[PDB]
Amino acid sequence: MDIDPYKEFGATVELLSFLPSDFFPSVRDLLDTAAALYRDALESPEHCSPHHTALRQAILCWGDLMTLATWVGTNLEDPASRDLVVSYVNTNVGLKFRQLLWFHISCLTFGRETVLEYLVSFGVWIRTPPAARPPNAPILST
Amino acid sequence: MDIDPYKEFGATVELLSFLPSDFFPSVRDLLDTAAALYRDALESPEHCSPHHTALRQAILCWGDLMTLATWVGTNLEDPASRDLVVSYVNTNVGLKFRQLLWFHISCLTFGRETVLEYLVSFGVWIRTPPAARPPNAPILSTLPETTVVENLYFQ
Amino acid sequence: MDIDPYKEFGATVELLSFLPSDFFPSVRDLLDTAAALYRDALESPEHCSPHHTALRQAILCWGDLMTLATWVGTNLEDPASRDLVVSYVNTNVGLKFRQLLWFHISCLTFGRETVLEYLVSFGVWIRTPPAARPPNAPILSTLVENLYFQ
Amino acid sequence: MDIDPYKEFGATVELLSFLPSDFFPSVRDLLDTAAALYRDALESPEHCSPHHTALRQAILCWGDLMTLATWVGTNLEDPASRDLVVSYVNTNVGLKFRQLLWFHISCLTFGRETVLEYLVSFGVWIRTPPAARPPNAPILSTENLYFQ
Amino acid sequence: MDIDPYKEFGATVELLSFLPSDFFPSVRDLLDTAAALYRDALESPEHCSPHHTALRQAILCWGDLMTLATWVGTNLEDPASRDLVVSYVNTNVGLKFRQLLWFHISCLTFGRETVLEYLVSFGVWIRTPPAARPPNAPILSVENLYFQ
Amino acid sequence: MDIDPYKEFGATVELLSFLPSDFFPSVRDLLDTAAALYRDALESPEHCSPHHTALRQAILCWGDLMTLATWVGTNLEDPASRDLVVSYVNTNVGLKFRQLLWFHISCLTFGRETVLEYLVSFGVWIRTPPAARPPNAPILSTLPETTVVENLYFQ
Ligand SMILES: O=C(Nc1cc(F)c(F)c(F)c1)c1ccc(F)c(S(=O)(=O)N2CCC(O)CC2)c1
Ligand SMILES: O=C(Nc1cc(F)c(F)c(F)c1)c1ccc(F)c(S(=O)(=O)N2CCC(O)CC2)c1
Ligand SMILES: O=C(Nc1cc(F)c(F)c(F)c1)c1ccc(F)c(S(=O)(=O)N2CCC(O)CC2)c1
Ligand SMILES: O=C(Nc1cc(F)c(F)c(F)c1)c1ccc(F)c(S(=O)(=O)N2CCC(O)CC2)c1
Ligand SMILES: O=C(Nc1cc(F)c(F)c(F)c1)c1ccc(F)c(S(=O)(=O)N2CCC(O)CC2)c1
Ligand SMILES: O=C(Nc1cc(F)c(F)c(F)c1)c1ccc(F)c(S(=O)(=O)N2CCC(O)CC2)c1
Ligand SMILES: [Cl-]
Ligand SMILES: [Cl-]
Ligand SMILES: [Cl-]
Ligand SMILES: [Cl-]
Ligand SMILES: [Cl-]
């Protein structure tokens, strides 16, 4: 099956890709923000919203991936190739989860339309060369 | 955070653990069934239901895990070590996803109540030694909400 | 082009794929059944139905594959590899034709909706581990005025 | 069973054989014409016509025959015996599929009666010796309901 | 993105591909025809039509492609390498622009629906073997009360 | 023939030249923005506007140049030269295409009159020596949909 996790939320993988990689916080900083803002809702027996349902699964999936990556790095054929599994996480699946976690956390905080407008505003601003770019980035606010 | 993926759906990790591991189809057989029964809804731009939203993420998460496991296994010279990665998937994260996929797929067809009643019925039947247990396992189906006498009375 | 031969019949290659390979009868047995049930219609100068048209072509296509396999094994090969090519055709493309012949024969015999519901029922049953699986498979089957008694 | 693929379409294998082998377009050109003129209909979930059903199957069957002949050519370790398989295909089943693809594509494009009348006209004209044969071939010239 | 340059003009890349490569004029002859028939319009500050807008860009793009292909051809030392590049251009982007320039020039000159009907007619005619093909290609182009 | 691709749009090559070369985004960033903002219109069977028709052709033309330059590079004997022809294209026509893609994308987003006024404003600002140049560049922004006069009229 070819599922786009953003599609039921009015976005697409291609649109999230318009943000540069270094826009996103780390997964750890995203997970700490999800707890600070939504821990009680995420841990409750209520659905709350489709964003909460999706965010719950993503949090648990990152736990699955890191447990697997930890086992690989620890019970290893080599020494110091641990650096290799880390690099794959940083390059590949870490970026996917930074996009996804940022998307759900921001939509819960600012609303989908505000988030998507900001995404396009920032993506255009950051691609404007510094010769022309206004000094302050667009603002994400309700 | 300590999130139980079943809690918003009226169940718990411990309850799903009551089914034995060899009750569940493989992840592959579950994913092929999810596609045969629900592909169009899963791929659509509509939420459809909280079970659909959760099932979408679980399908994608399995892809993430297998891609990671494949990259590791492919970049391993020792073929016995590739067999270690497969065995780790089979022993640990495969069973979690067999439980989770089975739960959402079955709930989407039969409803939470029927599924949880069946889970408990099967878990009790399979723990009964075979001399005492009827030869046929409990059946998974939604029981009629009313008797035939009740149905006819309200015609 | 990207033609799916099931699409005009309300199905897809991927849906037929949901049945395991060992569900389908052999090609020989499918061709025997097509003859026993439908020979006169298949040989008639009438279209009869889209299923009949498709089934005619499928039967002839299998004939083309077998004729080619045999001519290659007969005219050329040693006696030992006489059946080598027939063996490849049955291995690779046999499953595709077992699916296709089964679909049209069963649709003609039981109706499309009955067949498609049975297909999904069987695919779920067979993926249920035998610990939990009821012993009997799902069944493929199809189903006076008051004045008379006054 | 004895199935003639043309019988439900009002023709026969023997009638298509009345056209000389070099009358028919190549398989490549027939497949490109089916795509250029009918790709959307052939790929649609609608039956459209008995010709569409036959064309769908014939197109897919040709693909299978090509995979089979290729496997034969690759696994026949004698380079001369790969050459017999090719020439046999061109002489026998290649001609069968050129006939079949031509028939259905032409019926959809020019109309069934027009195709069948033209077929007989062309077959008579080409058998007329050049001492007597007019220089130009007969003329082939131009919703749909299908009874039994 | 997957942009088909013909889609906004009611055609597709696959349909233009139905014409054989030797149907099209050379690029030089297409560019001379665009100039002879449309130079003033193409050079004007008016849009004129979407065909003119597309044709302007295609003419300029071909110039860029030719400046590149020329630079490559001149700086190669081996005649077989230079012929590899010409052959690659002729088969690929050279053919694409012959198709594209022909399409817009002919739509402007003969009308769009005339062009599309003719394309399909020609593609079928040229695939008909010469044994059956008519010698000439397809053509591209009151009551009494009235007088009382 | 002497065709200026900007002439039917009320501009000229020389006017686009008034912007310095390091003003323009990279080709990759322009193509990413065209997709993010206009993919559906660009891929649709409608003309939409002369800017869309021109932008479609420019996108495809850059692709043609890159495909040819990439293929030629694959034939070069020295693997270190694999991108030599791609570099030649960027060096000789990269700026031309950055100008053209920027022009159509910005006109679709802000309107031709706004774009041309901004172009002149920026070109004058950047030529003002830094001793006198105010720190913030002119701003490129869409006109408001309704004027203050109209807003007050409907109060
Ligand atoms: O996306 C952002 N941050 C982020 C998101 C997450 F989902 C995280 F998990 C996480 F760690 C950080 C972001 C982007 C722009 C921005 F300007 C600010 S802001 O300065 O903080 N701010 C401005 C004023 C508003 O009123 C509120 C927010 C924050
Ligand atoms: O698909 C089946 N068989 C098949 C199909 C073909 F197209 C063939 F060519 C061919 F040889 C065999 C099949 C599947 C399930 C099944 F239960 C039976 S059943 O027992 O025979 N049966 C039950 C009662 C009904 O009333 C009638 C049929 C048959
Ligand atoms: O859980 C089961 N199967 C399963 C679930 C999934 F989520 C899968 F992905 C997958 F492959 C298989 C199961 C358990 C008991 C059982 F009896 C049957 S049954 O025989 O098939 N059956 C009975 C009648 C009903 O009406 C229908 C289904 C199936
Ligand atoms: O496409 C054709 N030519 C072409 C197109 C271009 F875009 C060119 F740039 C260019 F050089 C040549 C073509 C095709 C068939 C054909 F029969 C003729 S025709 O003889 O010339 N003719 C017949 C009567 C009509 O009324 C007028 C045209 C011309
Ligand atoms: O059978 C023919 N062509 C064919 C068929 C197919 F099924 C193909 F796939 C394919 F490539 C070519 C054929 C035979 C005679 C003939 F004169 C022409 S004609 O010149 O083209 N012509 C004349 C005027 C009409 O009005 C239209 C058609 C075409
Ligand atoms: O031309 C610019 N950027 C650009 C154009 C393209 F065509 C691209 F493809 C691409 F990547 C970047 C540009 C120029 C000045 C400027 F100030 C900004 S701004 O800061 O982003 N901004 C300000 C507020 C408005 O409201 C909106 C936009 C952007
Ligand atoms: Cl909280
Ligand atoms: Cl579905
Ligand atoms: Cl049982
Ligand atoms: Cl019979
Ligand atoms: Cl079509």
Author numbering:
A (entry chain C): 1 to 142
B (entry chain D), F (entry chain B): 1 to 155
C (entry chain E): 1 to 143, 149 to 155
D (entry chain F): 1 to 142, 150 to 155
E (entry chain A): 1 to 141, 149 to 155
Paper text:
The HBV core protein (also known as HBcAg or Cp) is an essential component and regulator of the HBV life cycle. The full length core protein Cp183 or its N-terminal domain Cp149 predominantly assembles into a T = 4 icosahedral capsid. To identify the specific interaction modes between core protein and HAP_R01 or SBA_R01, we crystallized the Cp149 mutant Y132A, which remains as dimer in high salt solution and destabilizes Cp149 capsid.
HAP_R01 and SBA_R01 bind to the same dimer-dimer interface in the Y132A structures. For SBA_R01, the contact surface is 402.3 Å2 with 60% of the area from the B chain as well. The binding concave and cap of SBA_R01 pocket are composed of similar set of residues, except that L37, T109, F122 from chain B and R133 from chain C do not directly contact SBA_R01. In contrast, the piperidyl group of SBA_R01 is fully accessible to solvent. Noteworthily, the benzamide core of SBA_R01 does not superimpose with the dihydropyrimidine core of HAP_R01, suggesting the dimer-dimer interface of HBV core protein can be targeted by different chemical scaffolds. Although SBA_R01 binds to the same interface, the conformational changes may be so small that the energetic difference is not sensed by other dimers.
